[PDB]
Amino acid sequence: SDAQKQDWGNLKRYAEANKELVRKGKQKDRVVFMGNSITEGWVANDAAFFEDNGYVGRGIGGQTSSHFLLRFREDVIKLAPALVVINAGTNDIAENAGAYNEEYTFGNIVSMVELARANKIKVILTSVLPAAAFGWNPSVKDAPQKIMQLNARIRKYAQENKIPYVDYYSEMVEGDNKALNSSYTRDGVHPTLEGYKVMEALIKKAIDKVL
Amino acid sequence: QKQDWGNLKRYAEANKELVRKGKQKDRVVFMGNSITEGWVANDAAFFEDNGYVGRGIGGQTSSHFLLRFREDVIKLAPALVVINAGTNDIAENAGAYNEEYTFGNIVSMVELARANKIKVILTSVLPAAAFGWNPSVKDAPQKIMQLNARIRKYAQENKIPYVDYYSEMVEGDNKALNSSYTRDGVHPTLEGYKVMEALIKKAIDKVL
Ligand SMILES: [Cl-]
Ligand SMILES: [Cl-]
Structure with a gap:
């Protein structure tokens, strides 16, 4: 039925991929990125x-x-x-x-x-x-x-709990209207590859400090 | 904009009222569905x-x-x-x-x-x-x-009390909810709730 197909959280999306990862066994220094379309x-x-x-x-x-x-x-x-x-x-x-x-x-x-x-x-x-x-x-x-x-x-909570906070925002914002930098988004929300390269430099540095 | 899949609206006002009145020693919150409601x-x-x-x-x-x-x-x-x-x-x-x-x-x-x-x-x-x-x-x-x-096995492993309403309330080879404790076969009547109360209050008093 249509009702039986309901899956609000979309657990189905990665169910098979997760089973395949688990089959490979424990992996050293695995980092999972949780997010929405920016992460996808x-x-x-x-x-x-x-x-x-x-x-x-x-x-x-x-x-x-x-x-x-x-x-x-x-x-x-x-x-x-x-x-x-x-x-x-x-x-x-x-x-x-x-x-x-x-x-x-x-x-x-x-x-x-x-x-x-x-x-x-x-x-x-x-x-x-x-x-x-x-x-x-x-x-x-x-x-x-x-x-x-x-x-x-989020930044305050991170400080109170000794969790690293990675500030993509401050590197990517532009203008009084607080747009995503025009040079590396088309739609104003999602980065282009150039934008992702800015994020990669920040997040890899932070990941390496933790691992 | 009216979407609220988890129904956080249901108790939002009731919760604000409780928080205003201040935390209470020994408060117990019951989480559940229509059986709890x-x-x-x-x-x-x-x-x-x-x-x-x-x-x-x-x-x-x-x-x-x-x-x-x-x-x-x-x-x-x-x-x-x-x-x-x-x-x-x-x-x-x-x-x-x-x-x-x-x-x-x-x-x-x-x-x-x-x-x-x-x-x-x-x-x-x-x-x-x-x-x-x-x-x-x-x-x-x-x-x-x-x-x-x-649930029982997990509870035992983690030293969490498990309250077994089911064992007191089940009846018959068909594992029904006892006809004395329900009208519709799923939801307890008051008589069923009194059975649950005795179980849960004894367990709560041990923990608190
Ligand atoms: Cl942490
Ligand atoms: Cl506990």
Whole structure:
């Protein structure tokens, strides 16, 4: 039935891939990247960055921090990684799962951190990327303010818990309208390869400090 | 913009009221579905007299519970959370049943509780001979027993009390919910709730 097919969290997306990874056995210094289309697109645009370094992408387009929390056990914990990199909030602010509530989104990140720590997985937290607006939801007129406010909460939580915070945002924002840098996005939200190369330099340096 | 899959709206106002009034020593939060929701409806005094807080929502699965856990449990700063989860997972209210996924969500809640110094009581999924609203599920009794065995084993391994409502409430070769404890075959009546109360309050008093 259609009802039986429901899979709100999209656990199906990586179910087979996870089984294949698990079959290979424990791997040293595995890093899983949790996120939405920015993380999914990262693997799509620069697979070598992941493959060269033993990183595993678990991004799914359109998803919010609520979806990530639901997938966290299967798509992170069960892969027995050394470290998880969390990029969450863009689609929350874009209202993909309903009205944005910062407290709920921030709480989902904290929950993921707690689940990682309960399973001896190290965490890196990251800034939500700049966006002046979201192409698919122009009704959101205060994306910049929301992004900054959430990022400040994530950064403070990271400091309070001795978790690295990787600030993609400050390197990629441009203008008084707080756009994603015009030179490496087409749509204002998703990086092009040039943008991903900026992110790679930051995240690899932080990963290497932790591993 | 009205989407709210986890139904965090249900108790949002009630939670704000509790947080204003300040944390209470020995608060117990009950997480669950209509069985937990109906408990409060049928015996408000049980909750009120004992400083227990019900956070059940009809139809929900363990996935919904996980999404609500921080707002409806952690932020209430309780001493203890009682988790009853799995009926609607097996009934496939939110899609195909996967024991690994449902059990995983319970483990996730346990880990979030422990990360916040909240004690846990785990409980048995109640018996049901069948779920009339979903006739495609032909093996509910078998699934309930297997999930419960898994929960019990995990509880023992992690020194978490397990409260076995099922063993007191099951009847017959068809593993029905006792006809004295239900009208519809799934949801307890008051008489059924009184059986549950005796079990859970004895267990709570040992922990607190
Ligand atoms: Cl950490
Ligand atoms: Cl405990």
